[model samples]
Structure formats: C-alpha cells, structure tokens
Target: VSISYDPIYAADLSMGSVACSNGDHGLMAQYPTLGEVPGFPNVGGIPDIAGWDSPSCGTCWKVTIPNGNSIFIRGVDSGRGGFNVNPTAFTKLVGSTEAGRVDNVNYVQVDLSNCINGAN
Candidate 1:
C-alpha cells in the first residue's frame, strides 16, 4: 500500500498566501481547485489545486526526494513535484511542450515508488 494525506483546501486564489504543511511557505495556489481535494496524484480534471491561467506562468511544483523517482507531473494547474522545480517538474515531462496546454482533460502525476515508509 501507499501513503496519503488529507486533501488541503484552497478557495481564495487572491488570499495573499497560505502556509502548506508540506514544507510550503511562500508558495501560493492559483490553479482554482474550488474545495478540498480527494487526494494527490490527481489526473484528468480541472485540478484539485488552484493557480496558472495558462500552462506556463505556474510551474512551481515537483516531487522532492533527494534523487528523482517515478513521481512526476503530467499537466498544468500546479502540482509539479520536488517543491518549486518550476520551468520543469520532473524527467517524466522534461520537453513536453504539449503537456503545458491545460486541455479539457489534463492533470499532474505522482508515483508512490511503492516504498513502505512504515507498515501499513
């Protein structure tokens, strides 16, 4: 099994900024997710997070774990990985220019690596 956390709420896109428990401080959400997210590794939707009018502008998200793993970003609307990789989220989507379009069905991705942090 994999580990997961409660979906964080992000309503106001212009509320200045909020401190995220995931080591997020100055970072802010502008993807417009509406309410609580079901969970991370969100795919094919409006995106649970908020920010980025276009695919560009907001590349501020990426999975961080010393060395790169399977966890990768798929679409726009925030949720890259490694925290603030920006311009680029991970190797999964290095030169994927089309992935930044934010089409009707686009989303970010994250691999659990299937490593047991603790006993499930």
Candidate 2:
C-alpha cells in the first residue's frame, strides 16, 4: 500500500480510543501477549476504509520510508486516512518527527498469525 504517515502516542491506545478492542478495552489491554511478539515493536492505525473486521486490523505490516528505513507495525486502530503509527515506529521510519506528515510511504502485509487479534 502506498500511503502517508502520521504519529500517534501511547495515550491514543487507551481503552476505547483505538479500533481493535474488546468490549471494554483496547488491543493492549485485551491482548497483553502482544508485548512479547517480535516484529511488532509499534502499533498503528490504518485507513478507515479497512474497517474493524477487515484483514488490515490486527495484521502486521512492513512499512518503509523513502530513505529505505523500515519498521514492522501492527494495525490496531482505524484513522481518517493513511497510517498513524506510534512515535517509536515513526522515528524508526523517518528519523524525526519534524515534518509530522510523511507521504509516499510504502507498506506490505506480513504474516504474524499468532499476533492477529481484532475487535470482539
């Protein structure tokens, strides 16, 4: 997917703020096991076109920046447009947050079957 990049924070993942959630809480609270999953250092919000039950949710993606830097981000929320990733993932891909919005970002879906957990 060719998309833009924006940065999100820990606070954005709170109970009901993110898309991937249990009836009472968000992904982190519902699936604490994610913290041990490799290749998912950061969580992200995918475009709204991919709804709560879409394959985009709970899936892992390899997102690469123009400079060839890449990071593995797991989809945990639905945003207005493009990819909204955590600061850690954002910095890893772009090196800094000075620009705030990055365009032409490329991403590919990856297999992390065990990590998949969507809204209930």
Candidate 3:
C-alpha cells in the first residue's frame, strides 16, 4: 500500500534561488517535468526519497498561485537513487522565472488528493 494526504495550505511561496525547483519540471519529469531533479539523471519524474528515510515514494501535492494558477507535484523514482535528489513544482506563484514574484501569498490553497491535472 501507499500513503496520501490532503492539500497543504502555504502562505509563503516564492523563488529562493533553490537552483532547481522551477517551471523547469512538472509533477512528472523527463523528457521533462515541472522542475529539475539534481544529478541530471536524464531520467523522468520526481526523484526518489530513499535517503530521505521515506520508503515507498509517490507523494503528490497540489499547488496554487494567487494570480490564479495551480499544479500538482509528485515523487517518482526514475532509477536514480540516493538523497538530495528530487523535483520542484516550479510556477509563477513561486516566482520561478523572475525570483520574488509572490512572497507571502497568504491562503495559496493546495490539494494533494492526487496529481493535479486541471487547467494546468
């Protein structure tokens, strides 16, 4: 069996020069995803969280931008193991391209029921 949870309400959502987490990848990566997964695995989807101590990967999240945009993010192991390896839900809400776009976007709702795939 796997694990799941409801949406996580975050007020502070902005770009922080995190290196990789940006519109560079999506919920699923490679050929391309919403952000970048370090190691440049040249793989697909979110990176595994093995070293992170979380076995049975596959945690999804629903992110929303105040300007009015949202997307889903999940962890998928593309055979690239270890720690510090994962994807980012890059979007305008997070001030992806031009850092500091929307910091402290209070009540920026989210729904991790499953992969967000509407009006993406």
Candidate 4:
C-alpha cells in the first residue's frame, strides 16, 4: 500500500518512553543492524528506524520512495499518524531532508528474520 512519510527526530524515537513495545528505547542506536535489503542503494547506510501508528510497533517495513529507492525500517514508536522516519532513513528514500515530507510513498511489511529484534 501507499502512505505518506515525515521527518522524526532521534529524540522523538524515545519520547514518552512508551510505544507498542516497552523495550523500544534508543531505536536508532539499538538497531544499527537494520537497513536496506540486498540489491539497493546504500545511500542511507543503515536502515534507520521509524515511528508508526498504534499496533505497528516492532514490525518491519520496506519503504519505497518516489525515486524508486528502498529502505528497511522497523517500527520502534507508535502514534505517528503514518510512516515517520529518522533523518538518515528519510534521506535514503528521498535523497534530501529539505522537503520535510513525502506523500504517497509505497510500503509493505517485511519479514523479521533478518532484524535484530525479529522475534518481537
């Protein structure tokens, strides 16, 4: 399906100290092993983390931008309206942060077997 994306701060990832999962703290630092799948641009380096709406926390998603680049993001926080990603992840998908937001971007749930917290 398609959805919009917005910029979220590193601090916001840990805001309120509450998410769908209580253990999701310092998501960006904690999940450095998560990122783009094989056969994609490496611009974003690591997959970068994201904040999703309620009930999506701990889920992994592969987001494809208008530019056709893809990045893997794990839901670490909740109640973000739509897909809210860290700066690096956003840049990886869209190439820059000046736009602040991207609309109608493609996304899909991905397997957790490759992630650090996949078991969650």
Candidate 5:
C-alpha cells in the first residue's frame, strides 16, 4: 500500500536546522517558493556550506486535509517540537518572492492550479 505522511515528510517546516561555516546557522536556509527540492535529484541548489547539517531541512514532506484545504508539514523539526509547532517556518515563506519547489503530493491531491501557497 501507499505510505502517507512518512515520518520524514510528516516532519514540521520549522523543525531541524542545517547550519553552515562562519557561524552561518541554517537548515536548508528555507523552503523554495516555486521549484524543486534543492538537490532532490541532487541537482545542488542548496548553497554551498563547509558544515552541512544532515537531517536538517526546511519544508520537504508531510500530511494534510482537503476541502478545508488543510495543509501538510514542511521544514526542519527543531528541538521545540518539530516544524509543525514552530511558526517561524511558515512565516519565512508566507509571502516570499523567491522560486519554490512544488512537489506532486499524490495522496492529499494538492491542487497545483493556483497552488501558490506555502513553499509551493
């Protein structure tokens, strides 16, 4: 059967925090606004860092509800309580202008058409 809301994807958008060299704190900098997951195919979109925190991420996968247009989880899961709890994750990209990575969520059936919302 198809696995829905995998733990990794079920993760929150504000969870995790990939840091970098030179005191540069990061965890994927943030989720994309209209593009593919940086380096998903390992294309290498995420900025180069001397200290890449593995497992740390910002918006990758999760669950959601339809009709009410329920949204899924994204970003890294910080110690606070995963990205689902941290509001910073959502605030980072609430109205960003950068290009984001849009994933084809087969289960939730995300309406791609005009789906310019969170990290889409």
Candidate 6:
C-alpha cells in the first residue's frame, strides 16, 4: 500500500545553547540548519539543501514565524533532548536577546527555493 505521510506542519518553538547545524557558536554569525527528524519534510519557504537524509545533514528549510520574522535553517542537528527540532536554529531565528522560546507559535515551510544552503 502506498501510504502518504503528511509532513509535520505545526510544532512548538524552543531554543538551546549549542552550536547550530550550520556550525557556529550561536547568534550573529550565520543561519542555523532548520533540522527535521527522519520521517517527513518540515521546511518552509525556498529550501536550499537537498538530497540528504534524516538523522543527518539533509535539506535546510526556511522557517517563518507569524511575528514578521523569518530564518534559514537546516534539520541536520539536534537539541538537549532527542526531539525533531533544533535549539540553536530557533534561538538564532528569534534573536538570542530574549529567553529562546516561542510557545505554541504558528510556523510554516514556505519557499522551498529560498531555503538555506549547506550541511553540517
């Protein structure tokens, strides 16, 4: 049976304090990798990286928050816990000036072309 898997569209936003997928200390350097688990695609807006796989350096995504702020990230990294999200990416996107966490926020994977490029 050819089953269809609906990519994870809605997810909560959180942050952490580690090197991002793009391999950096954290803010003010470059965009992090909008990482995803090994199952479906959760990228939004012009994804750049492609041809990789889950649990590894895969496609980077363009995550857009409703707060008029957007960021380029890859789902090739992980956080403190073993979740499908990245802390460094989230922190960088939301600006590290604040507490690093956007609760119950609405996110989307738009512009597969505008997505970030590179793998770590």
Best by lDDT: 2
Q: Of the pair 3 and 6, which is ahead by TM-score?
A: 6
The candidate scoring highest on TM-score is: 2
Q: Model 6 segments beyond 4 Å from truth?
A: 1-56, 79-92, 110-112, 117-120
Could you give candidate 1's per-residue lDDT for residues 56-82 as a string of tens digits? 322222233322333332222334321
Instruction: Name the 10 consecutive residues with the lowest summed lDDT in model 5.
Output: 39-48
- In the range 7-120, model 3's lDDT, one tens digit per residue, is 121212111212223243322234233223211221123334343223434455444455666454444332242212212334323434443233332222244343434322
Q: Where does candidate 2 stray beyond 4 Å?
A: 1-8, 11-13, 23-41, 48-55, 113-120
Tell me the tens digit of each residue's lDDT in model 6 across 1-120: 010111232233221322223233232133322233312233221112232222334344444455566555444333332223333344445555254444444434444344433212
lDDT of each: 0.27, 0.58, 0.31, 0.47, 0.28, 0.34
Question: TM-scores, in order shown?
Answer: 0.22, 0.67, 0.31, 0.55, 0.25, 0.34
Please report how far candidate 6 places residue 28 from its true position, in Å. Answer: 23
Arranged by TM-score with the best first, the candidates are 2, 4, 6, 3, 5, 1
Q: Tens digits of per-residue lDDT for model 2 on 77-112?
A: 676768777666676677876767777878777777
The regions of model 1 sitting more than 4 angstroms off are 1-19, 22-46, 49-71, 74-85, 90-100, 108-111, 114-120
Model 5 lDDT on a 0 to 1 scale: 0.28
Better of 1 and 4 by lDDT: 4
Where model 3 places Cα greater than 4 Å from the true spot, the runs are 1-56, 76-96, 100-102, 105-113, 116-120
